[PDB]
Design a binder for this molecule. Structure first.
Ligand SMILES: CNS(=O)(=O)Nc1nccc(Cc2c(C)c3ccc(Oc4ncccc4F)cc3oc2=O)c1F
Ligand SMILES: Nc1ncnc2c1ncn2[C@@H]1O[C@H](COP(=O)(O)OP(=O)(O)NP(=O)(O)O)[C@@H](O)[C@H]1O
Ligand SMILES: Nc1ncnc2c1ncn2[C@@H]1O[C@H](COP(=O)(O)OP(=O)(O)NP(=O)(O)O)[C@@H](O)[C@H]1O
Ligand SMILES: [Mg+2]
Ligand SMILES: [Mg+2]
Ligand code: NI
Lengths: 260, 322
């Protein structure tokens, strides 16, 4: 646990699906998320156990996790813009090989998290940052105790796996559900757009994706997107989760097409 | 604008109130972020948050909604331009509009302050809303939907208790309707909710119209009549446990599409009211009643002739001084 005295909350950045981000100082530049959760005592222990796991993570494509405060979490501050802003706001000029490289580094960070037995639960371009140019940084991974217990979906609809939408079983979260969310990030990279651009109804998206009536339009992938990368997007967003590849195979496929 | 008032069929007091509001809009020029002084929060939701503010140049009390969106600057400017149509949406059943601007990554929508809040907030205090009050609510929603259809050729798209506002003068007005096509598209990228008032045909992605808003009104009327979101329907024991002797989001959507619609309990409500919401909740939009048929329904014809002190009921319920 971090002492609130040493935390110097500076400016407010914004709020997401489970907290409000502030820039701060704690032995250096730090990011602080005031969680929207009065927690139950059973949840507070599950939170402290998750923090012990997330604090030990060490990878170049993963944002550092510092600790908690009293509820709030302290993470590594990133001065770059999120991938969502690069693709959908600023429209940053990206080469095709640069888009593949962003996909590769994101698969490396996800492969590290899964090899450390950590499910992201909320993989999307909003939680990917470009650090000092073209170094991917993944944030907001895990935190199932503070994002949600109640067996109800939480997060952005567009990246949510169909079995996570349905919540038929109490735990629809797996490595494969992260792969679907990663596949939607691939769709963002290889189209420059969000999925379901013809559907402007959030509840319609939840229902049709849950029933399998709606899937990302793969005809909108860039024409110069390689066939192997096109197949990778289709494999990651398979409706049946048992047909999706895992990140060891995803990373190898990217490394194969990258070295041509 | 004052000429467009003559095209509406209003009583004399409704015309005076609209003419007065149009006069106050003249005291409003460009809207900047530094011209507002916060007074209090009014509520929050999925898209954004709402404040009661004071516009220092004009001195007018306004409700300022802030919607946070990460969009291209061209989409943002197109949203601000499309919201200007609200300057011409003047009706006793539509919430007034003052202006829209962008700042701090937030699109601000400044609108008429309704000191009674939403019917969602009123329901949380009243527990249930009487049938005679819901008769006036139904008339206001039908006439507001009719105004948007005839005068602006648009539908609401988000009818629900939180988007029906009331005030201490007894007025009932609609808000948060889809006037900006770019704002509808941008807000489709949203977080998952916990309940829905969406019609079955819009969930399935087939053809839709104002008939979908009629469904949402019917579902909203049942919720306020029984004091509970009516999906899934309550038990017969739960009915007596509410009038006197939890599903996840996808499961709710599947229920709306594949299961019979909810209905009012018999006995505690008039047969006219029960039939009224039944015709609103017919799942096939072609069999569902339309705005013309609802206005001449027996429930509306009786409610329209009733003398109901709605402002006094609000005052006695939420403490809103007239
Ligand atoms: C769930 N149904 S849905 O999926 O179709 N989503 C959507 N539904 C409906 C609309 C929209 C977008 C929208 C919003 C939310 C909006 C909010 C306030 C507003 O200000 C005033 N409003 C009325 C009177 C006076 C005003 F000052 C204008 C607005 O204009 C808009 O267009 C949606 F995204
Ligand atoms: N570690 C960080 N460093 C810098 N900015 C951050 C960091 N984490 C979040 N932000 C920013 O803070 C704002 C809100 O963050 P956040 O609460 O994560 O919203 P979100 O990521 O879009 N939705 P979600 O992460 O699912 O809750 C956004 O502008 C983010 O870019
Ligand atoms: N013009 C207004 N005058 C007074 N109160 C208002 C006004 N507009 C909104 N409010 C209040 O502010 C609250 C927040 O509204 P809003 O941000 O639209 O979320 P919501 O409609 O209530 N729920 P959701 O649509 O799911 O986000 C509403 O519930 C009202 O109680
Ligand atoms: Mg985030
Ligand atoms: Mg609203
Ligand atoms: Ni390589």
């Amino acid at each position: 646990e971090i002492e609130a005295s040493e935390v110097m909350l500076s400016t407010r950045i914004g709020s997401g699906s489970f907290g409000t981000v502030y820039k701060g100082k704690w032995h250096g530049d730090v990011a602080v998320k005031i969680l929207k959760v009065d927690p139950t005592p059973e949840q507070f222990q599950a939170f402290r156990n998750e923090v012990a796991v997330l604090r030990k993570t060490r990878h170049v494509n993963i944002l550092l996790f510092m600790g908690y405060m009293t509820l709030a979490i302290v993470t590594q501050w990133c001065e770059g813009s999120s991938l969502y802003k690069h693709l959908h706001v600023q429209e940053t000029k990206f080469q095709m090989f640069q888009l593949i490289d962003i996909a590769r580094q994101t698969a490396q960070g996800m492969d590290y998290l899964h090899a450390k037995n950590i499910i992201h639960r909320d993989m999307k371009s909003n939680n990917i940052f470009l650090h000092e140019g073209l170094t991917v940084k993944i944030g907001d991974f895990g935190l199932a105790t503070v994002k949600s217990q109640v067996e109800q979906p939480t997060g952005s609809v567009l990246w949510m796996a169909p079995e996570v939408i349905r919540m038929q079983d109490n735990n629809p979260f797996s490595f494969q559900s992260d792969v679907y969310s990663y596949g939607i990030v691939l769709y963002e990279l290889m189209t420059g757009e969000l999925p379901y651009s013809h559907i402007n109804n959030r509840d319609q998206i939840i229902f049709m994706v849950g029933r399998g009536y709606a899937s990302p339009d793969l005809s909108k992938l860039y024409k110069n997107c390689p066939k192997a990368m096109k197949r990778l997007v289709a494999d990651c967003v398979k409706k049946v989760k048992e047909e999706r590849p895992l990140f060891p195979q995803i990373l190898s496929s990217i490394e194969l097409l990258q070295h041509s | 604008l004052q000429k467009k008032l003559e095209e509406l069929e209003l009583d004399e007091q409704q015309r005076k109130r609209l003419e007065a509001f149009l006069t106050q809009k003249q005291k409003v020029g460009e809207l900047k972020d530094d011209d507002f002084e916060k007074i209090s929060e009014l509520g929050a939701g999925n898209g954004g948050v709402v404040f009661k503010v004071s516009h220092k140049p004009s001195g007018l009390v306004m409700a300022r909604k802030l919607i946070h969106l990460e969009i291209k600057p061209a989409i943002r400017n197109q949203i601000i331009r499309e919201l200007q149509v609200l300057h011409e949406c003047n009706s006793p059943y539509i919430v007034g509009f003052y202006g829209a601007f962008y700042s701090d990554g937030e699109i601000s929508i400044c609108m008429e302050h309704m000191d009674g809040g939403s019917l969602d907030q009123v329901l949380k205090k009243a527990g249930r809303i009487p049938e005679q009050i819901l008769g006036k609510v139904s008339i206001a929603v039908i006439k507001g939907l009719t105004y948007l259809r005839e005068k602006h050729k648009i539908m609401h798209r988000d009818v629900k208790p939180s988007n029906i506002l009331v005030n201490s003068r007894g007025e009932i007005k609609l808000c948060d309707f889809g006037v900006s096509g770019q704002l509808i598209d941008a807000m489709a990228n949203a977080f998952v909710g916990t309940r829905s008032y969406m019609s079955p045909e819009r969930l399935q992605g087939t053809h839709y119209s104002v008939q979908s808003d009629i469904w949402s009104m019917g579902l909203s009327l049942v919720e306020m009549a029984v004091g509970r979101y009516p999906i899934p329907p309550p038990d017969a024991k739960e009915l007596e446990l509410m009038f006197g002797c939890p599903m996840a989001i996808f499961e709710l959507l599947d229920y709306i599409v594949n299961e019979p619609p909810p209905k009012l309990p018999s006995g505690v409500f008039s047969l006219e009211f029960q039939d009224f919401v039944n015709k609103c909740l017919i799942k096939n939009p072609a069999e569902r009643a339309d705005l013309k048929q609802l206005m001449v329904h027996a429930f509306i014809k009786r409610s329209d002739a009733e003398e109901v002190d709605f402002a006094g009921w609000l005052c006695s319920t939420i403490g809103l001084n007239q």
